[PDB]
Amino acid sequence: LTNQLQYLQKVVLKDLWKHSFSWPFQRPVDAVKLQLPDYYTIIKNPMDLNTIKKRLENKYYAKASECIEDFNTMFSNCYLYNKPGDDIVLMAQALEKLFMQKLSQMPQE
Numbered sequence: 137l138t139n140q141l142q143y144l145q146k147v148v149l150k151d152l153w154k155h156s157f158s159w160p161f162q163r164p165v166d167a168v169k170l171q172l173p174d175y176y177t178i179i180k181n182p183m184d185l186n187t188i189k190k191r192l193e194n195k196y197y198a199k200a201s202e203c204i205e206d207f208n209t210m211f212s213n214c215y216l217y218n219k220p221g222d223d224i225v226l227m228a229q230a231l232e233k234l235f236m237q238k239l240s241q242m243p244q245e
């Protein structure tokens with residue numbers, strides 16, 4: 137694992153996982169269970185922290201930018217599907233500020 141990919145795994149993913157708002161994002165969205173109509177019609181690329189975790193574990197990414205794109209897809213999926221000011225959006229926004237902070241502190245390429 138690349139120097140930056142290892143940071144994304146051992147710092148960024150770890151710190152997002154430990155954040156008190158991350159639990160809804162630690163597994164695929166169960167739209168049936170959560171009663172989210174049309175979720176998988178509206179979201180053309182689902183993403184969650186466990187999928188990113190396993191992609192890092194399985195050496196799926198060739199570049200750190202590809203992993204960063206998946207994190208961003210998580211957050212943008214949430215903002216696209218849910219109303220602004222919904223709890224899940226407010227939690228995602230706080231999680232996302234932590235994520236961008238950790239990118240600011242990433243070792244350069």
Ligand SMILES: CNC(=O)[C@@H](CC1CCN(C(=O)Cc2ccc3[nH]c(=O)cc(C)c3c2)CC1)NC(=O)c1ccc(-c2ccccc2)cn1
Pocket residue numbers: 157160161165170172213214217218223224226227230
């Ligand atoms: C006593 N239980 C509380 O009250 C909780 C209720 C929350 C309801 C929504 N959830 C779900 O898992 C259900 C759900 C709904 C739509 C979703 N749509 C998707 O796309 C993807 C997902 C996976 C999704 C999942 C998180 C729990 N809410 C909070 O804990 C809480 C924490 C912090 C804030 C906050 C307020 C202002 C500023 C910043 C943060 C608000 N609420």
